[PDB]
Each structure stands twice: as structure tokens, then as C-alpha cells.
Amino acid sequence: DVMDVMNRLILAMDLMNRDDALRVTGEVREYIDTVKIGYPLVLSEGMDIIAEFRKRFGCRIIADFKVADIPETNEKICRATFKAGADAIIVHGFPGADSVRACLNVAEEMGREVFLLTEMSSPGAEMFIQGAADEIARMGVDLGVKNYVGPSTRPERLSRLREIIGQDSFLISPGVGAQGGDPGETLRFADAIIVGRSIYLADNPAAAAAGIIESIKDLL
Amino acid sequence: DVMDVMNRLILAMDLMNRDDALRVTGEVREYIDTVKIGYPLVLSEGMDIIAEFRKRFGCRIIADFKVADIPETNEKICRATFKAGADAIIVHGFPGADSVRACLNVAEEMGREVFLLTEMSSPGAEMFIQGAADEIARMGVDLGVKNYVGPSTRPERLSRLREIIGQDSFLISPGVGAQGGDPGETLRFADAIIVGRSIYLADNPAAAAAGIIESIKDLL
Ligand SMILES: O=c1cc(O)n([C@@H]2O[C@H](COP(=O)(O)O)[C@@H](O)[C@H]2O)c(=O)[nH]1
Numbered sequence A, B: 001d002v003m004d005v006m007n008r009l010i011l012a013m014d015l016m017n018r019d020d021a022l023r024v025t026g027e028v029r030e031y032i033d034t035v036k037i038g039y040p041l042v043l044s045e046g047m048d049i050i051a052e053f054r055k056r057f058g059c060r061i062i063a064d065f066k067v068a069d070i071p072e073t074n075e076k077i078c079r080a081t082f083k084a085g086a087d088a089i090i091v092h093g094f095p096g097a098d099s100v101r102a103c104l105n106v107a108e109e110m111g112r113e114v115f116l117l118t119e120m121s122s123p124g125a126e127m128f129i130q131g132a133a134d135e136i137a138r139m140g141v142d143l144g145v146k147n148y149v150g151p152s153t154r155p156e157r158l159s160r161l162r163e164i165i166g167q168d169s170f171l172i173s174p175g176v177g178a179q180g181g182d183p184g185e186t187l188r189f190a191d192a193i194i195v196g197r198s199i200y201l202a203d204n205p206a207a208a209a210a211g212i213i214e215s216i217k218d219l220l
């Protein structure tokens, strides 16, 4: 019933030029079937990059756009994003339920998925988001959200998120590697890990990906 | 000093195709020298839409990207956005001080401006954002933020935001027209109002803009 991510590993492709992004993704293609594409790449190379990734790799694409506007604008963003061929979109929960529902409506209309971001992995998340995160997660459950994002850098917060959403929901988690999160510990709670710089800034991205997978091989 | 916004009126250009967006913006050019371009237009037409607006109208451009990621990704978003020619970018404060600081550092390096969004005008903002809003504003002031966005639909919140940031800071305010905010009342606190649908969906956008301006004539 959930998305099936090869090797429980999602590449965060945040390189900002097309040649490098395509080359690095190609180098690791044997290890993944799911790529997270965000604004660094999209605002540098255009939304057409999504269709190009599908043409070259036949990977699923999660548009990490941290959608965080009013309902009317969220609807337009989701429509433009899914028109470009994204399979899923990541939406902030902090702006409230109506803004999430606007995204859920468009995803249902176009055959796509919404991922609800509940607590972020960066230190500043402790200031405002963390105190609201359990409530944001319960809001997700109330709204029928099935896909969530929570922080590798705080395994106790990631475990709590898993507790709230249940074992049947799908949970992906960034902050692995460069931000300090451990792949194996994160996969105790998340279905899949998101990895960016540890792979795409590596001297040998293929070896970097292979190494991460080796470290979690008994979890696959 | 602050940006000199003609008629205290900023167009929210959220049409999603180049031809309509260009037509409507040209139609109101005599009334407005400041245009807010967001993701509905950018994700539909590309970042080169900024260049096209600068070429056709010479209007100032505020990139309404509600930047809301970790510091490292925020930096990349700001760099790409200013590279494309945006005068300013709008940033969420709820992800915390580090994420805002990342944007400020890029804006300082590149000679551009950050606007901090503290609370939103839509109903769901009451769930989580509102209760953090005074503190998000105070954080902005502590970080040296000079430009702010606050909600016309909540006068008590907009007035408190103005108090916190002081009279010298620059404050712009959406939610006027379609969302119910009143132009004159909003300008008691905001330096400028942001107006989208009331203008861009009008049979005659020029007449719509002229009508808004006539209603606030004594405030100019
Ligand atoms: O809380 C979050 C949510 C994210 O989407 N991300 C995203 O996940 C990726 C993490 O990449 P990296 O492995 O290079 O730290 C980035 O694209 C970032 O924007 C994050 O780091 N923390």
C-alpha cells in the first residue's frame, strides 16, 4: 500500500547544474529508484528537469518544495508541480490544516502523493517547529495523510513521529550523513533515508552509495 | 531607507501563463512599480520570467518563495533567486533563526533584501503560526531583518507586528480584497498592500487598481 523505495535510499539531488546532476544520478542509478528534487536544482535548471530525470532513469520523483503558502496558492503550486511529472510533493504542516488539505485535493485529482513534513532536521527547528510537531503529526493523521518526513538528527523525535502515525504509514527521513544522522539507526523508525551531500559531493558517489547500503544491508 | 513602492500597492502576479501574466502586468503598469512573483508563475514559466518582467516593465521584483528549508538549502535557493534578478525574497521565520540567517547572509553578500514572513493571512495560520508570531518577529529584529510580511486579515496581529518591528522597518501585507482585508485599514500599519485576485481576475485590471488607489488616496 506504500511506495516501494529501492534499498530504502532516496537521493537528494541538490546539485545546481544539469550536467553534474545528470552525471551523478547516472553514477548511482543501480542503487536507487527514487530521487528527491528540490528548489536548488529546479530554480537553476527549470521544471523540465523532472521529465528529463524520468526519461533518463525511470525513477520516481519526489518534489521537495516545502509547500508553505495559503490554500489557494498551495493548490496552484501542486498543480504546476504535478504537471511537470512529479510523483509526490513535500508540504509543511506548520501553516495549518487548510493549507495541507489544498495539497491533498490536487494530489488526489492527479494521482500523486503528499508527504507531510512535521519536524525539520536543522538546529533552528527546536525554536518553533519541534513544540508543534506532535500536533502537526496528529493533524496529518486526522487529514488522512499517509506519508511523512521527520528528522534523522533526532532519533527520539523520529521514533515519536513513527509512534503517532503508526507502522502502516510511510516515513522518510533526511539529515543522514552530512548533518550527522546514522543510516541504520534512522531505519529503525523510517521506511527510507534521504541522503544528499554524502553521496553527491563524494569523490566517488557510486562508492558512497554502495557504502551506505553495505552498512544497512541486513535491514534490506 | 526603504524601497519606494508606487501607490503603496504591490501586485501579486499569480497567473500561471506568460501571456496572461505579461498582459495584466502591463495593463496596471501606470499604477504599480513593484511586483510580487511567486511559485505559481515561476514553476509554470521558469525563472526567466523575472528577466522578462524586468525587460518589459522595469518593475521591482519580490520573489515570494516562502523559503522554508534547512540553512544549506536556503542558501542555494537565495543564490539562484538573486542570480535570476529578484530584488528581494520572502522567507518563512518558523523554521528558526539559522534558516533565516542563511538567507540574510546571502542577501548581504549579493546586495539584495530578505522579507521575513511572521504570520499568514489564511485561517489555518491560527493553528501553529500565530502563537509563535510575536517571537518570530522579535527574532527577525534581533537578526537585523528590516523587511516584513504580515496579515491584513488580522488587524490586531498586524498592528502588534508593526509595534515589534518599529516604525523604521518596512512592512508589506497581503490578504487585501479577495481574502477580505481592507486597503485603508491595512495601511494604518503596513507600508504597502499586496493585492492579487482583485486586480488580476478583474475584467479591467487597470480599473480595479485605480479603484483601490482611489480608496486610499488620502494615504499616499
Ligand atoms: O528537515 C529536513 C527536511 C528536508 O527536506 N531536508 C532536505 O533533505 C536534504 C538533506 O541533504 P543532505 O544529506 O545533503 O543533508 C536536503 O535537500 C534538504 O533540503 C532536510 O535536510 N531536513
Ligand SMILES: O=c1cc(O)n([C@@H]2O[C@H](COP(=O)(O)O)[C@@H](O)[C@H]2O)c(=O)[nH]1
Residues within 6 Å of the ligand: A069, A070, A073, B012, B014, B038, B064, B117, B119, B120, B121, B122, B149, B150, B151, B174, B175, B176, B177, B178, B179, B194, B195, B196, B197, B198
Ligand atoms: O500570509 C500571506 C502571505 C502571502 O505571501 N500571501 C500571498 O499573497 C497573495 C495574495 O493574493 P490575493 O490578493 O489573490 O489573495 C498570494 O500570492 C499569496 O500567496 C498571502 O495571501 N498571505
